[PDB]
Amino acid sequence: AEPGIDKLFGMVDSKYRLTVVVAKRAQQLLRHRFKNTVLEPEERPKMRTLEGLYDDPNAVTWAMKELLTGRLFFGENLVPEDRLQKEMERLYP
Amino acid sequence: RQRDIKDEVWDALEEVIHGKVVLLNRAPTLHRLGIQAFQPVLVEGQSIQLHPLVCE
Amino acid sequence: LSQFKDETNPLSSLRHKRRISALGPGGLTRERAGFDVRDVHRTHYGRI
Amino acid sequence: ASEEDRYTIAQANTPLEGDRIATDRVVARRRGEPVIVAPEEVEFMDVSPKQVFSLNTNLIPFLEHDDANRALMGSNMQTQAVPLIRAQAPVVMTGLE
Amino acid sequence: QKRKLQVGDKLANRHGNKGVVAKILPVEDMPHLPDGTPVDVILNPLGVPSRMNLGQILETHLGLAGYFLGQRYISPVFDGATEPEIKELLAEAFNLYFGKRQGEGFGVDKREKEVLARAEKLGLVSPGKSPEEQLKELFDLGKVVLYDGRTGEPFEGPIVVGQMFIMKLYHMVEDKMHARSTGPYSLITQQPLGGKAQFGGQRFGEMEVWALEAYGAAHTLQEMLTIKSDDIEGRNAAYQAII
Amino acid sequence: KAPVFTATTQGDHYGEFVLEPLERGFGVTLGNPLRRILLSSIPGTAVTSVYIEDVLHEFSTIPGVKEDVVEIILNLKELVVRFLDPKMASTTLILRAEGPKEVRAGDFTPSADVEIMNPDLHIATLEEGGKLYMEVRVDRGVGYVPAERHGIKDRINAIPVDAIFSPVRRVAFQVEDTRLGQRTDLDKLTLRIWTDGSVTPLEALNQAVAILKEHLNYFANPEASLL
Amino acid sequence: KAPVFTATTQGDHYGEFVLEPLERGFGVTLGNPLRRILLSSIPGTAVTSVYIEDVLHEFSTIPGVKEDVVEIILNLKELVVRFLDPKMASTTLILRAEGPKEVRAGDFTPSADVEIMNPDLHIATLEEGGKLYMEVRVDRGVGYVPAERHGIKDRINAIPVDAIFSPVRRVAFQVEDTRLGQRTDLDKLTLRIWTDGSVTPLEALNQAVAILKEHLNYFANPEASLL
Amino acid sequence: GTAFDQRPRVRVGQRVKKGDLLADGPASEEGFLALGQNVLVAIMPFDGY
Amino acid sequence: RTLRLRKRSDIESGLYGRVLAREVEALGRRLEEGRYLSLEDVHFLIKAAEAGEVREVPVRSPLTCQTRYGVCQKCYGYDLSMARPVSIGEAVGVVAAESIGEPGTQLTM
Amino acid sequence: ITQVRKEKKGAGMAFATPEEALAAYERGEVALNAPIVVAGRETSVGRLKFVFANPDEALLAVAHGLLDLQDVVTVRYLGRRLETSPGRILFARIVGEAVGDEKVAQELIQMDVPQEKNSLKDLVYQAFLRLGMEKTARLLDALKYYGFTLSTTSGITIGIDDAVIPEEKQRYLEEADRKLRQIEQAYEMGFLTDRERYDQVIQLWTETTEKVTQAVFKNFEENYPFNPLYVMAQSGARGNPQQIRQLCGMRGLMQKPSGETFEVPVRSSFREGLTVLEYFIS
RNA sequence: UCGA
Ligand SMILES: [Zn+2]
Statement to judge: residues F111 and F186 lie in one domain: no
Query: Helix I39-50 vs helix I8-15: angle between axes, to the nearest 10 degrees?
Result: 130
Closest alpha carbon to G201 in J225, F224, E177 = F224
Task: Please tell me the number of Cα atoms within 13 Å of J274 on its side-chain side.
Answer: 32
Residues F160, F152 contacting (CB under 8 angstroms): yes
Contacts of J232 (CB under 8 A, 6+ apart): E45, E46, E49, J238, J239
For position E118, which CATH number holds?
2.40.270.10
Calpha distance E211→E226 (Å, rounded): 17
Determine the distance in angstroms separating the CA of I106 from the nearest CA of chain B, rounded to an integer: 13
Burial of J49 (0-12, 13-18, 19+ CB in 10 A): buried
Handedness of CA F120, F122, F125, F131 (dihedral sign): negative
J64: chain F residues, CB-CB within 8 Å: 25
- DSSP single-letter state for residue A7: H
Beta bridge partners of residue E3, listed in sequence order = none
Q: Parallel, antiparallel, or unpaired for β J51-52 and J73-75? A: parallel
Quick check: helix, strand or coil at residue E7? coil
Angle of CA points H36, H40, H41, to nearest 5°: 95
Q: Parallel, antiparallel, or unpaired for β E159-168 and H37-42? A: antiparallel
Determine the distance in angstroms separating the CA of B25 from the nearest CA of chain G, rounded to an integer: 26
Statement to judge: residues F83 and F23 lie in one domain: no
Centroid of chain to Cα F93:
18
Query: Helix E55-69 vs helix E83-103: angle between axes, to the nearest 10 degrees?
Result: 40
Beta bridge partners of residue I59, listed in sequence order = I20
Residues E214, I101 contacting (CB under 8 angstroms): no
Statement to judge: residues G14 and G49 lie in one domain: no
Q: Class of the A1-93 domain?
A: alpha beta
Q: How far is CA J241 from CA H43, J210, J214, J220, J229, in A?
A: 22, 11, 10, 12, 10
Domain that holds residue F48: 44-165
- DSSP single-letter state for residue D21: B
Statement to judge: residues F75 and F113 lie in one domain: yes
Torsion of CA F29, F30, F36, F41, to 10 degrees: 150
Contacts of C37 (CB under 8 A, 6+ apart): C22, C28
Quick check: helix, strand or coil at residue G189? strand
Residue-wise DSSP of B17-45: HTT--EEEE-SS--SGGGEEEE-----SS
Calpha distance B16→B40 (Å, rounded): 11
Q: Is I80 annotated as a binding residue?
A: no
> Is F225 a member of any domain?
no
Determine the distance in angstroms separating the CA of C30 from the nearest CA of chain H, rounded to an integer: 31
E203: chain B residues, CB-CB within 8 Å: none
> Is G226 a member of any domain?
no
Centroid of chain to Cα G188:
28
Boundary (domain end) residue, out of G121, G142, G165: G165
E168: chain D residues, CB-CB within 8 Å: 81-82, 84
Torsion of CA D10, D12, D16, D19, to 10 degrees: 80
> Is G227 a member of any domain?
no
- DSSP single-letter state for residue F11: T
Method: X-ray
Statement to judge: residues F52 and F144 lie in one domain: yes
Q: Parallel, antiparallel, or unpaired for β I84-85 and I78-79? A: antiparallel
Burial of F189 (0-12, 13-18, 19+ CB in 10 A): buried
Q: Find the helix or strand (DSSP H, E) in which J84 lies.
A: strand J83-84
From the CA of C6, how many Å to the C1' of K1? 11
Q: Is I65 annotated as a binding residue?
A: yes
Q: Find the helix or strand (DSSP H, E) in which J182 lies.
A: helix J168-189
Calpha distance J78→J52 (Å, rounded): 12
Closest alpha carbon to F73 in F21, F123, F5, F29 = F123
Which chains reach chain J with 3 or more Cβ–Cβ distances below 8 angstroms? A, B, C, D, E, F, G, H, I
The total of other beta-carbon atoms located within 10 Å of residue E31's CB is 23
Are E213 and I94 an interchain contact pair (Cβ–Cβ within 8 Å)?
yes
Q: Do F and I make contact, counting contact as 3+ CB pairs within 8 angstroms? A: no
Are H44 and E146 an interchain contact pair (Cβ–Cβ within 8 Å)?
yes
A58: contact with B, CB 8 A cutoff:
yes
C44: chain J residues, CB-CB within 8 Å: 280
Q: How many domains, in total, are found in chain G? A: 2
Statement to judge: residues F209 and F179 lie in one domain: yes
Burial of J78 (0-12, 13-18, 19+ CB in 10 A): middle
Residue-wise DSSP of F39-82: TTS-EE---EEEEETT-SSSSSPPTTBSS-HHHHHHHHTT--EE
Angle of CA points I11, I14, I15, to nearest 5°: 85
Calpha distance I42→I78 (Å, rounded): 13
Closest alpha carbon to G37 in F26, E147, F2, E148 = F26
Centroid of chain to Cα H1:
19
User: Which residues fall inside 5 Å of ion ligand 1, going by CB?
Assistant: I 65, 67, 72, 75
Burial of J251 (0-12, 13-18, 19+ CB in 10 A): buried
**Chain K nucleotides with an atom closer than 7 Å to a protein C-beta:** 1-4
Q: Do B and G make contact, counting contact as 3+ CB pairs within 8 angstroms? A: yes
A3: contact with J, CB 8 A cutoff:
yes
Closest alpha carbon to I58 in I43, I73, I45 = I45
Calpha distance G71→G77 (Å, rounded): 10
Give the nucleotide with minimal C1' distance to the Cα of D80: K2
Query: Helix E206-215 vs helix E218-225: angle between axes, to the nearest 10 degrees?
Result: 160
For position F108, which CATH number holds?
2.170.120.12
Are B42 and G184 an interchain contact pair (Cβ–Cβ within 8 Å)?
yes
Calpha distance J45→I54 (Å, rounded): 51
Statement to judge: residues F98 and F145 lie in one domain: yes
Calpha distance F128→F148 (Å, rounded): 35
Amino acid type, G66: K
Statement to judge: residues F83 and F124 lie in one domain: yes
Boundary (domain end) residue, out of G141, G165, G189: G165
Quick check: helix, strand or coil at residue E68? helix
Output the furthest CA–CA distance in chain I (Å, rounded).
46
From the CA of H21, how many Å to the C1' of K1? 35
G86: contact with F, CB 8 A cutoff:
no
Domain that holds residue D24: 1-48
Closest alpha carbon to I91 in F139, E218, J206 = E218
Calpha distance F140→E168 (Å, rounded): 33
Domain that holds residue E104: 3-176
Calpha distance F226→A9 (Å, rounded): 33
Which resolution, in Å, applies to this structure? 4.0
Statement to judge: residues G125 and G160 lie in one domain: yes
Handedness of CA F149, F152, F158, F162 (dihedral sign): negative
Calpha distance J43→J72 (Å, rounded): 10
Q: Which of G28, G32, G36, G176 would you mutate first to test chain E, the one with the most E CBs within 10 A?
A: G28
Residue-wise DSSP of G7-72: EEEETTTEEEEEEES--TTHHHHHHHHHHHHHHH------EEEEEETT--SSSS--TTBSS-HHHH
Handedness of CA G56, G60, G66, G69 (dihedral sign): positive
Task: Please tell me the number of Cα atoms within 13 Å of A42 on its side-chain side.
Answer: 1
Q: Find the helix or strand (DSSP H, E) in which G192 lies.
A: strand G188-193
Residue E109 sits at φ, ψ, to 5 deg, of -70, 150
Amino acid type, I8: R
* H-only helix segments in chain H: none
Amino acid type, J121: K
Contacts of J42 (CB under 8 A, 6+ apart): J35, J36
Are C11 and D54 an interchain contact pair (Cβ–Cβ within 8 Å)?
no
For position D18, which CATH number holds?
2.30.150.10
Amino acid type, J32: L
Output the furthest CA–CA distance in chain J (Å, rounded).
77
- DSSP single-letter state for residue F3: P
Calpha distance D44→J75 (Å, rounded): 73
Centroid of chain to Cα C33:
13
Boundary (domain end) residue, out of F165, F183, F201: F165
Q: In what order do the strands lie in the sheet with F188-195?
A: F4-10, F14-20, F188-195, F168-176
Burial of J15 (0-12, 13-18, 19+ CB in 10 A): middle
D36: contact with H, CB 8 A cutoff:
no
Statement to judge: residues F124 and F52 lie in one domain: yes
Statement to judge: residues G8 and G71 lie in one domain: no
